[PDB]
Design a protein around this ligand. Sequence first.
Ligand code: TE4
Ligand code: TE4
Lengths: 154, 154
Amino acid sequence: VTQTMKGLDIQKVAGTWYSLAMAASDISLLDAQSAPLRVYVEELKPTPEGDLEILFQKWENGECAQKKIIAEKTKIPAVFKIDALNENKVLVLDTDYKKYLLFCMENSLACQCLVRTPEVDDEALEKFDKALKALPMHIRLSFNPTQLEEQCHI
Amino acid sequence: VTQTMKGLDIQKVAGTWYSLAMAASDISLLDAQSAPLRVYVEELKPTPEGDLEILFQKWENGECAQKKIIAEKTKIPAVFKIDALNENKVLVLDTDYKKYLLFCMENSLACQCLVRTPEVDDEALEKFDKALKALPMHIRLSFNPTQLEEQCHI
Ligand SMILES: CCCCNc1ccc(C(=O)OCCN(C)C)cc1
Ligand SMILES: CCCCNc1ccc(C(=O)OCCN(C)C)cc1
């Protein structure tokens, strides 16, 4: 991935978001309620040091678990690191802070269209599909306003 | 769905096809290996009477089953009926006979991009995405050339 947000201000992504849409390189990354990159974002909390804590839900062991991860900053403002068995990158592609944010997680790849409200944002989906045009995605999911107001988008 | 192939010649769709891509109105229609509209097309056999027998595979009870369905003609050449508990329609959106065919099954909705060979047809995917632009799809899957040569696209 070689789309990053030039000039990103990480403090301005703070707050409420909805996972409107998701996509991944491999079907198995999103196909089941319990698939590993089926993660629903709740809230971003930038630290004063400029790390980004992520609140999200994950369907786990037949139910909707509350989860909390922190992505550590790098020399590149639009690029964060999650420590695990593998070195995994979080990239911010594009945001306008007040309506949408596009990002990817990569080691292979999953991306999302975040929005501030439980509404279908045709414009934000256009920009998302445009950004995926380049990437080798084999599954795409989108959610309706009813699902967006439910735990794990049921 | 109000995209049908004007002038369709049902005899000319006979033969080998690959389910390159699928999409559906509802995630649950395609999400699992065993989801009900995860059906992989093998072969179309038009009858002399102008019905269309469909050979396909379905992941069933932990394995890849061989299946055979016949879709009955209507007064509209691009529209067929499958008899079940519900009245279910098969619509041919568009074909060039020698490379691609787009169709939908509807009662709510699932569509596919068929191709004659195990190759990624960028052009045929463009026409497919164009045809879905209108429809309310919430899941899309595509398959690579390796998967296309395997039973149930493993
Ligand atoms: C704009 C930044 C959004 C980042 N959001 C998320 C990033 C990662 C995860 C997440 O669940 O991490 C997956 C685990 N690692 C080891 C692959 C969940 C949400
Ligand atoms: C160009 C025509 C292609 C039609 N292909 C297919 C049509 C239907 C099916 C199929 O599996 O039918 C689903 C069962 N009914 C009752 C909803 C599988 C393949």
